[PDB]
Design an enzyme around this catalytic site. Structure first.
Site, PDB file in Angstrom:
ATOM      1  N   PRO A 161       0.830  -1.242  -0.137  1.00 20.26           N
ATOM      2  CA  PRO A 161      -0.122   0.156  -0.148  1.00 20.26           C
ATOM      3  C   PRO A 161       0.968   1.170  -0.021  1.00 20.26           C
ATOM      4  O   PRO A 161       0.211   2.295  -0.568  1.00 20.26           O
ATOM      5  CB  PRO A 161      -0.767  -0.168   1.349  1.00 20.26           C
ATOM      6  CG  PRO A 161      -0.122  -1.092   2.140  1.00 20.26           C
ATOM      7  CD  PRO A 161       0.657  -1.860   1.225  1.00 20.26           C
ATOM      8  N   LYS A 162       2.069   1.195   0.528  1.00 19.90           N
ATOM      9  CA  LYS A 162       2.979   2.485   0.594  1.00 19.90           C
ATOM     10  C   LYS A 162       3.883   2.528  -0.547  1.00 19.90           C
ATOM     11  O   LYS A 162       4.872   2.660  -0.447  1.00 19.90           O
ATOM     12  CB  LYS A 162       3.785   2.480   1.727  1.00 19.90           C
ATOM     13  CG  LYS A 162       2.946   2.540   3.244  1.00 19.90           C
ATOM     14  CD  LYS A 162       3.535   2.852   4.421  1.00 19.90           C
ATOM     15  CE  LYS A 162       2.548   3.273   5.247  1.00 19.90           C
ATOM     16  NZ  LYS A 162       3.363   3.692   6.865  1.00 19.90           N
ATOM     17  N   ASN A 163       3.229   2.507  -1.591  1.00 21.88           N
ATOM     18  CA  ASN A 163       4.088   2.609  -3.108  1.00 21.88           C
ATOM     19  C   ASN A 163       3.506   3.587  -4.094  1.00 21.88           C
ATOM     20  O   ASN A 163       2.277   3.461  -4.121  1.00 21.88           O
ATOM     21  CB  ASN A 163       4.126   1.161  -3.534  1.00 21.88           C
ATOM     22  CG  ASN A 163       4.829   0.995  -5.123  1.00 21.88           C
ATOM     23  OD1 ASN A 163       4.235   1.615  -5.922  1.00 21.88           O
ATOM     24  ND2 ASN A 163       5.945   0.708  -5.118  1.00 21.88           N
TER      25      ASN A 163
END
Ligand SMILES: COc1ccc(S(=O)(=O)N2Cc3cc(-c4ccc(C=O)o4)ccc3N(Cc3cncn3C)C[C@H]2Cc2ccc(O)cc2)cc1
Ligand SMILES: CC(C)=CCC/C(C)=C/CC/C(C)=C/COP(=O)(O)OP(=O)(O)O
Ligand SMILES: [Zn+2]
EC number: 2.5.1.58
Lengths: 403, 315
Positions: free
Chosen positions: B109-111
């Site tokens: 999710p943190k991309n």
């Protein structure tokens, strides 16, 4: 007498959860827990404190990483120039000179990174992108030699930048990529240092940046988004390069950075009601110098000429006591792992908390031992002030490709 | 089809289907910097990916290959770009591509790349039906995920999907009233629907924010929301406020309470009000209560404030 996090009064700065508990509080409570452990270490143990910057340990970590990396770094394979920049910059801060051996191999590598259409990509023959183009150019300036400057093909840098420029004054991060204030600042950092700013390039940009400042006072990634340290740094910095700080509401920006120092930890969080993190030692704290210069180009008579508008000592205490890995390198917070990103930015942050410059006035604050002082860092670019001078002066000699 | 973590996994150099194409090793030069000592699996995939990229092979096998390159390094924007070029050439089913990027986002999710790619899909498909609910699920795992909010705003804007958001916002604030991403969202909904320049609304808002500040006085997010909605207009426009904050001081005090009072006094003094030198001292006083006792992490900021007040409300 002597260390602000250890003072008895300080126990008071701990979270008041007004007896209402959410994920936010539980989780903040948890870091305060581990941070208290680290602070209390010095008491409970039975000997007095004295704070050392593990320089030689950081150096061996850096020296080695500049050359070779384990496969834990597979995921930074699109970010290699970043790795150069992060490591070289940590070296120059710790005041370690770059052998011609290394300088020239970095040179040649960044050259392999350079696209035939301008800019640099994450590795050889990857497509160009603004973050690595910014990292490449900074690494090249940290190097400062003629070889390094000559790597940059300025014609194409300007083509590339134009090809990313959007109608609304914003930029794409890369062709077919997307937008976000980072691209503004990278474009600004790289255009300015290499003297390729044409009159039209940043048109609409400052106004686009301005739109990203929000109801919190800080800047968000794109208009509408929560205020956040990395993006706020990019915004302000891009605005100082562009000489349009005035566009922002600098008073709420200030009130916002300042509210981001954590009262107990002493470090900074990236955004409100989130967690302290050592890389914010630069992204947030490095705002204060930028804000100082900007209020100063407006006669603001009430500014200090000793200190930045944050608790310099507490930031230092956080970096030294909590963000240092015994093995070498630095980190987000206790319990996390080393990396070169945090080695870079915790140190960039410690340098900022050590050194106040402001026209005539220079004044330092070096916590713990005095071998801790780092070389100063330029807060717009986060390379050394000299390397900024040196490279602008040089690029100022060719003309803006145009002319 | 043949997953990277399948025990049948075979290096691309051992695959029949690839017999006809020579790997392109990475050119790092004679003596390299920041060299990553890649695993076999990884270097194998990327050698073959360079080969397909050079030759610009627009083929199904190249398409499956990009999958693997992405899984090994979801940050490689060059690979995502090629995957998009392949989605158009091979004219692939985008609904199916959506199920893919759903899966990956859920994993990383943190991309940036992963959300950007989803965005380009929704743009191509011209279709946001899946988005709120999707976003809602990531947000259910990390209520503060910056890209998930960024994506959400972008969708709500593009497709005018405002109708149900404030109620999303209330569900989240209920679950964590300290979620500053949710307060930012509230500001973003209202500011784009009704606006804050409607008195019923500014009231309902302000009444809500005080009601939160009551329940949890030490949550700074409510405090910043309160200041954010009023200060556009000028805190001294609202004379009850100064008074009302003065009330709950004993039973609910906090450095946010004191700092708000100072913002109020600041606005009064700039609006040529009752007691120019009078108010100045209430302010300057609390500047020391904050700088010296109640909020010393900011001492340097509070002394700038006291000292700015003086420097422009003296005569
Ligand atoms: C969890 O692993 C990573 C690795 C890299 C990233 S990043 O490129 O998006 N970037 C830099 C960053 C780097 C590191 C790191 C790992 C190894 C090294 C070299 O030794 O550096 C680690 C984290 C990281 N992050 C994530 C982070 C930082 N502090 C807290 N966190 C959770 C930050 C991120 C910053 C950034 C860089 C470039 C850019 O264009 C946008 C954002 C994010 C997560
Ligand atoms: C020049 C350049 C490219 C600079 C980088 C700017 C920078 C640091 C941006 C941060 C962006 C982001 C999505 C943060 C959220 O991380 P998180 O939510 O995991 O962290 P947090 O909780 O501290 O916000
Ligand atoms: Zn960090």
């Amino acid at each position: 007498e002597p260390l602000y996090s250890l003072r008895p009064e300080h126990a008071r700065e701990r979270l008041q959860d007004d007896s209402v508990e959410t994920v936010t509080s539980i989780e903040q409570a948890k870091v305060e827990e581990k941070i208290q452990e680290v602070f209390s270490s010095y008491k409970f143990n039975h000997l007095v404190p004295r704070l050392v910057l593990q320089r030689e340990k950081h150096f061996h970590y850096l020296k080695r990483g500049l050359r070779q990396l384990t496969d834990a770094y597979e995921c930074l394979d699109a970010s290699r120039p970043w790795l150069c920049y992060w490591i070289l910059h940590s070296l120059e801060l710790l005041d370690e000179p770059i052998p011609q051996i290394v300088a020239t191999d970095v040179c040649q590598f960044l050259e392999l990174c350079q696209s035939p259409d301008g800019g640099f990509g994450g590795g050889p023959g990857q497509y160009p992108h603004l973050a690595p183009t910014y990292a490449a150019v900074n690494a090249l300036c940290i190097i400062g030699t003629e070889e390094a400057y000559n790597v940059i093909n300025r014609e194409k840098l300007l083509q590339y930048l134009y090809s990313l420029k959007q109608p609304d004054g914003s930029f794409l991060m890369h062709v077919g990529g997307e937008v976000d204030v980072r691209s503004a600042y990278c474009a600004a950092s790289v255009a300015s240092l290499t003297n390729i700013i044409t009159p039209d390039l940043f048109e609409g940009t400052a106004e686009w940046i301005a739109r990203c400042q929000n109801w919190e006072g800080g800047i968000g990634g794109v208009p509408g988004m929560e205020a956040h340290g990395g993006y706020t740094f990019c915004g302000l910095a891009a605005l100082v390069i562009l000489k349009k700080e005035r566009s922002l509401n600098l008073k709420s920006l200030l009130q916002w950075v300042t509210s981001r120092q954590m009262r107990f930890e002493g470090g900074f969080q990236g955004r409100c009601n989130k967690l302290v993190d050592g890389c914010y030692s630069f992204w947030q704290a490095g705002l204060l110098p930028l804000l100082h210069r900007a209020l100063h180009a407006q006669g603001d008579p009430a500014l200090s000429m000793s200190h930045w508008m944050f608790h310099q000592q507490a930031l230092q205490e956080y970096i030294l006591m909590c963000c240092q890995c015994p093995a070498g390198g630095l980190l987000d917070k206790p319990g996390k792992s080393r990396d070169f990103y945090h080695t870079c930015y915790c140190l960039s942050g410690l340098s900022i908390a050590q050194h106040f410059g402001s026209g005539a006035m220079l004044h330092d604050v070096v916590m713990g031992v005095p071998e801790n002082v780092l070389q100063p860092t330029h807060p717009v670019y986060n390379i050394g002030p000299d390397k900024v001078i040196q490279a602008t002066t040089h690029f100022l000699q060719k003309p803006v490709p145009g002319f | 089809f043949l997953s990277l973590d399948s025990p049948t996994y075979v290096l691309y150099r051992d695959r029949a289907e690839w017999a006809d194409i020579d790997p392109v090793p990475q050119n790092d030069g004679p003596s390299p910097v920041v060299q990553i000592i890649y695993s076999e699996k990884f270097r194998d995939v990327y050698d073959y990916f360079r080969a397909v990229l050079q030759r610009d092979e627009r083929s199904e096998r190249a398409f499956k290959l990009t999958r693997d390159a992405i899984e090994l390094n979801a940050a490689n924007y060059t690979v995502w770009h090629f995957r998009r070029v392949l989605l158009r050439s091979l004219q692939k089913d985008l609904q199916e591509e959506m199920n893919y990027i759903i899966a990956i986002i859920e994993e990383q999710p943190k991309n940036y790349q992963v959300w950007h790619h989803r965005r380009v899909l929704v743009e191509w498909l011209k279709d946001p039906s899946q988005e709120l609910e999707f976003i809602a699920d990531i947000l259910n795992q990390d209520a503060k995920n910056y890209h998930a909010w960024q994506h959400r705003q972008w969708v709500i804007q593009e497709f005018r999907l405002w109708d149900n958001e404030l109620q999303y916002v209330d569900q989240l604030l209920k679950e964590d009233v300290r979620n500053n991403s949710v307060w930012n969202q509230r500001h973003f909904v209202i500011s784009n629907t009704t606006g804050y320049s409607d008195r019923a609304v500014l009231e309902r808002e302000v009444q809500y924010t005080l009601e939160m500040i009551k329940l949890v006085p030490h949550n700074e997010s409510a405090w910043n929301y309160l200041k954010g909605i009023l200060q556009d207009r000028g805190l001294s426009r609202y004379p009850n406020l100064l008074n009302q904050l003065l009330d709950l001081q004993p039973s609910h005090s906090s450095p946010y309470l004191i700092a708000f009072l100072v913002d109020i006094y600041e606005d009064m003094l700039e609006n040529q009000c009752d007691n120019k030198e009078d108010i100045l001292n209430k302010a300057l006083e609390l500047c020391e209560i904050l700088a010296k006792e109640k909020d010393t992490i900011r001492k340097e900021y509070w002394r700038y404030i006291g000292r700015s007040l003086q420097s422009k409300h003296s005569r």
